[PDB]
Amino acid sequence: LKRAQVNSVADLLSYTYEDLLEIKNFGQKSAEEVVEALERIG
């Protein structure tokens, strides 16, 4: 994510799950991890 210039939660919220899967070497398990972390912050 930091390689993708994503620096804020707003920036990450600007990406869809598909855009997250397009991130180079980002896999489904890592997208799930991000979803779980966001749920951890509601």
Place this chain on the structure above:
DNA sequence: TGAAAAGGTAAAGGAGGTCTTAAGCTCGGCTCAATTTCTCTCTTTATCCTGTTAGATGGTT
């Protein structure tokens, strides 16, 4: 001599590309009626040429 401080090695796990099948389609070939060109004949017109024996003899607007 002890101790940073960097540099290796062996994993675990994931990420990513590359392979395999059940479902379905549509695509070309093959046959095979079904016809539009083509090329001859075979005509049939389309176009040009010549002649015509009562007598006639200077314009309209």
